[PDB]
C-alpha cells in the first residue's frame, strides 16, 4: 500500500521506471509497500537535500548529505529501536565499524551501504604502456620509489603524462582526517595516535611534498596541475594515477573493467576503517516520516535480498547480465550494462550480496576477503569534532589555507619555502592554535570515554 519516497544522489537510470516496477514486485509482496526513487543530481545534492530537511517537506528515505551535523539536529529518525526488529538482518550483517563510525550522541541514524568499510590509496598503472615498454613496477611502494618508472615513461613516451594528477591532489599517508574539511589536522596512525598534528609538520609528509616538487620540476606532473581537473582511464594519455581501492572493488578488477584494459595497482597506504570510509554512503529515515517502520523494512530488504538488489544494481536480467550455471553468486555482464541502465553499487545496498563478475579471479575474491578481515580501525573512528566554540576560527584558517593550499599540495611550489610561509601566516593570528587545542581537547575526551 504506502508509497515510500527515496531521494538518491546522481542522475537517474534511463530505465528507472522499469527497474522500480521489477523491484516493486518483490517489495510489495515482502513488505506491503512500494518504493519510489527520485534522483536529485550530482552537483547540487547538498543544496537540494538541505531545503528538504529544513522544511517539513515529506520524504521517507534519503541518501544523506552532511550526515554528522544533521544527525545532531534530530533531522533523522533514531534507528536504535528500528534495528532490533525491522532492520534486524541488516544490523546483524553490518561490520561493527559501520555502527561506530555512524553513531552520534550514543545513537545510530544511518543505514550505511556495506562496501569499502576500509580502503587503501594506490598507484594505478596503464598496463598497455607497462607492456609496450616493459616497465617494471615491482619496486613501487611510495611516491619516492615511483621516481624511476616516471623517468622511464618520460624517456620512452614523451607525449604521455607520467603521473596524472589534478588541482585536488594531496599526498596520501596513513593519516586520519576525522572531520571532512578544509583543515590540515590529522591523527598520524604511525605517530602518536593520541595527538592531533598538522600534516605539513609531519616529517615524511613534508618529504612527500619535496618529492612532488621534484616531480613537478622534472615534468612528471602537468605544469598546470594547480588549475587542471582532467584523465579518462580508457585513453593512453597517462602512465600512473592515484586511485582509492577497497575490498568491494576486488583489487584491480573494478578499475580494469572501467578502463576496459589492464590496470595494475600498487598500494601506498594501509587499509583503514575510519570516519571517511564508514560514512561515505548512508541512508537516513526522515524525522517527519509517516512510515518509519516500512521505510526501514525496505532498507532491510534492499540490503538482504539478492534478487532485489542485483536487479537494481545490475539492471534487467537477460539483457544486462546472465547467471553462470554451476557457479553460484557469479554473473556474466553483457553489452546492456555499459549503458545508464542500472543503479550504482556503492550507494544502493549491501555489496556482499551482489553477484560477482566472472572476470574477477579466484585469488581476487580471496585477497578481498582477507583485506576486509585484516583491516584495522582508526582510533579516531566515531570521533565527532564539535565546531560550536570555533566556527569563526575555522573559517579564518580555511580562508588563509585556501590561498596557499593548491600550490603546495600539487608540488607546484617548493615546500621548503612555502610551508614556513604558510605556518608563519597561520601562527600570526589566534585562530590556528585555538582550533588545534580545541580539537586536541575533544580528542582527549573522546579517548578517555570508550576507555
Numbering used by the authors: 40 to 269, 271 to 491
Quote the passages of the study that discuss this structure, keeping the authors' original sentences.
The genome of S. pneumoniae contains genes that encode a suite of proteins that are biochemically capable of performing the various concerted steps needed to completely depolymerize and transport all classes of N-glycans found on host glycoconjugates. We also identify a solute binding protein (SBP; NgtS) from an ABC transporter (ABCNG) that binds soluble N-glycans and, through X-ray crystallography, reveal the molecular basis of its interaction with these branched glycans. The identification of an ABC transporter that possesses an SBP, NgtS, that is specific to the recognition of N-glycan fragments suggests that this is likely the convergence point of the complex and high mannose N-glycan processing sides of the N-glycan degradation pathway, with this transporter functioning to import soluble N-glycan fragments into the bacterium.
The structure of NgtS is similar to that of other SBPs and comprises two α/β domains separated by a hinge region. Each α/β domain consists of a central β-sheet of three β-strands flanked by α-helices, with the N-terminal domain possessing an additional solvent-exposed two-stranded β-sheet.
